[PDB]
Structure 1
Amino acid sequence: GSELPQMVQQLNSPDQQELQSALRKLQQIAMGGNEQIQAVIDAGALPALVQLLSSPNEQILASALGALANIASGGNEQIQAVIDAGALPALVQLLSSPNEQILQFALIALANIASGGNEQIQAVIDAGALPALVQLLSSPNEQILQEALWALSNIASGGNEQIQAVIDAGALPALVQLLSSPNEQILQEALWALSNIASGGNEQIQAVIDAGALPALVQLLSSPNEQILQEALWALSNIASGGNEQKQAVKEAGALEKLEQLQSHENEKIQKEAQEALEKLQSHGSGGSGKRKRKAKLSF
């Protein structure tokens, strides 16, 4: 309430101490849920925060990113307000920053925007984010790689046209290569990304198959890691939701025997996901694939 208008005014303060302070307070208020986010938007914060993405002051920039990321953790309409204030061109340009901290925070903000509805996701694609995000799949910096993977995964949680944009940007070969990663964080994310691409139409599922995902996905059905096991099951289950050619590719890769054995796993969630995937492979229908979105905060 009554202190918020002052905080927003202070985003243009000639006193850098007052500015940085107001920015941090807004960032923190935007951690408090969608009603609190809406109070920040209603006080007029957005134009100023977006303007500050052009700041050459790295402390200001990092906090502005933090604030906008938190606002973009809200509802689809709150995300759309951020897009409407003009955030995307600045965020996309920041994907080329040589500052790893700024890059990380930019990625998180983009990822949150791409956790909105299909129209919000399409704005991200139309702003040109995908070629940069796909290029970052090759980063030797695990932190950067992890945040780019989340952004791609969220973009692939849209409709078939959004998924097709991801495929056409050349993401699949890198994502399939990541299924070999010894890094459990990266592996999990690569599986989210591929699962979401495999939640589209049959020709999207087939692009995943044609890029060579199945043998690695079937190997992961041998993991003692219950989290990785569930993630590989989700991916196989999405692919098995396609048509006959897709179901048949899954059978040719040897999944049947393993899916059947996994119905005897003590973990009830694994049991259930195995049974469901198996029923789809032997079913005559299609559909039932699952999409997942990730939202993250930034509390400084």
Structure 2
Amino acid sequence: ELPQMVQQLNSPDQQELQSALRKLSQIASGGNEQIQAVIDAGALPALVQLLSSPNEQILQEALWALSNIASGGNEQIQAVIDAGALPALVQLLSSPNEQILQEALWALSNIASGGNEQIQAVIDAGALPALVQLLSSPNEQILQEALWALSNIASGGNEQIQAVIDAGALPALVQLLSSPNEQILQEALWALSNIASGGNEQIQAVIDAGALPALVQLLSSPNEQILQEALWALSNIASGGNEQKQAVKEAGALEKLEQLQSHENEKIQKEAQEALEKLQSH
């Protein structure tokens, strides 16, 4: 019975509540179909309500369930947003409890893994200032969690990318390119690459932030993994705002890049004339 659990989300019996929660986390896993069934049973209102709980045991598992639900499709992500989860998630980003912070960042990043509609909701909720603050954290675990969420946000449209820039993320990112920690370097380059996958305005901001000297320095690295990550980002920078020459750090991006080469031709037909005509009008 699924409604029994949903009912039991309002139970004052913490033992009966915790069982319905962890079981819901189990149901939320296993595909968007089970996710949708949870959504249809009307659980989200009570779920989000528990995000204000001072009971870390309940809060944790609650965030766990919301994250699973948010791992579904954009439609299923949007239901989470509609339920009103973002404002509570954003405030939890200031928590001194690293356990809660991870769960909050996990849920928030899954929401930011959807469409620009979902990404923009994250931005409109005020999540970027907190995320940027965390980039200065000496906790490598917190740092990864924050970059993961920022990366997903920077994977959207140019306006989303620009929001990230205006939030002051680039200075922290550039400083991390000097880290001797290859794991931090990967995470930082991942985020940068998504940011460099925007328009000329966005790319120029990366340059103005002093990213190139560090990227250039890494081209000499004997670490093939660093090399790929550095080249990826620099390649996006050298794209000139042309999204057919950019690739967001996601599966299928390089394959798509190759396919677009054999179809930019008719798109390159009109650039060459724009070049000749503009020159002939010197």
TM bracket (short chain): 0.7 to 0.9
CA contact (8 A) 1:263 1:272 kept: no
Provide the secondary structure at the position in 1 that maps to 2:248: helix
CA 1:168/1:215 → structure 2, altered by over 3 Å: closer, same or farther? same
After superposing on structure 2, the runs of 4+ consecutive aligned residues of structure 1 that deviate more than 3 Å are 243-284
TM-superposition CA deviations, 1:187-241 (whole Å, max 9, x none) = 1111111101101001111111111111211222233333322211211111111
Offset of residue 183 of structure 1:
2.0
TM-superposition CA deviations, 1:115-149 (whole Å, max 9, x none) = 11111111111100111110110111111111111
CA contact (8 A) 1:240 1:277 kept: no
Provide the secondary structure at the position in 1 that maps to 2:62: helix
Offset of residue 4 of structure 1:
1.4
CA 1:79/1:253 → structure 2, altered by over 3 Å: closer, same or farther? closer
**RMSD of equivalent CA atoms:** 7.7
CA 1:248/1:105 → structure 2, altered by over 3 Å: closer, same or farther? closer
Q: Distance in 1 between matches of 2:30 and 2:137?
A: 33
CA 1:88/1:280 → structure 2, altered by over 3 Å: closer, same or farther? farther
Offset of residue 35 of structure 1:
1.4
CA 1:5/1:189 → structure 2, altered by over 3 Å: closer, same or farther? same
CA contact (8 A) 2:74 2:115 kept: yes
CA 1:120/1:253 → structure 2, altered by over 3 Å: closer, same or farther? closer
- Range that drifts further, 12-21 or 55-64: 12-21
Q: Distance in 2 between matches of 1:175 and 1:240?
A: 19
Offset of residue 20 of structure 1:
0.3
Q: Distance in 1 between matches of 2:227 and 2:259?
A: 13
Q: Distance in 1 between matches of 2:131 and 2:61?
A: 22
CA contact (8 A) 2:197 2:203 kept: yes
Residue 45 of structure 1 aligns with which residue? Answer: 43
Offset of residue 96 of structure 1:
1.1
CA contact (8 A) 1:221 1:233 kept: yes
- Range that drifts further, 235-244 or 47-56: 235-244
CA 1:88/1:245 → structure 2, altered by over 3 Å: closer, same or farther? closer
- Range that drifts further, 139-148 or 180-189: 180-189
Provide the secondary structure at the position in 1 that maps to 2:246: helix
Offset of residue 185 of structure 1:
2.2
Q: Distance in 1 between matches of 2:67 and 2:281?
A: 42
CA contact (8 A) 1:175 1:194 kept: yes
CA contact (8 A) 2:77 2:118 kept: yes
Percent identity (aligned): 97
Segments of structure 1 that go 5 or more residues without pairing to the other structure are: 285-300
Segments of structure 2 that go 5 or more residues without pairing to the other structure are: none
Provide the secondary structure at the position in 2 that maps to 1:180: coil
CA 1:77/1:248 → structure 2, altered by over 3 Å: closer, same or farther? closer
CA contact (8 A) 1:240 1:281 kept: no
Q: Distance in 1 between matches of 2:253 and 2:119?
A: 33
TM-superposition CA deviations, 1:91-128 (whole Å, max 9, x none) = 00101111111011101111111111111111111100
Q: Distance in 2 between matches of 1:223 and 1:258?
A: 27
Provide the secondary structure at the position in 2 that maps to 1:250: coil
CA 1:254/1:62 → structure 2, altered by over 3 Å: closer, same or farther? closer
Offset of residue 46 of structure 1:
0.9
Offset of residue 250 of structure 1:
19
CA contact (8 A) 1:239 1:246 kept: no
Q: Distance in 2 between matches of 1:270 and 1:251?
A: 25
CA 1:271/1:110 → structure 2, altered by over 3 Å: closer, same or farther? farther
TM-superposition CA deviations, 1:139-187 (whole Å, max 9, x none) = 1111111111111111111111111100001000100111112222221
Offset of residue 281 of structure 1:
21
Q: Distance in 2 between matches of 1:74 and 1:192?
A: 23
Q: Distance in 1 between matches of 2:281 and 2:257?
A: 15
Q: When the two structures are superposed, what TM-score results if normalisation uses the length of structure 1?
A: 0.79
CA 1:259/1:223 → structure 2, altered by over 3 Å: closer, same or farther? farther
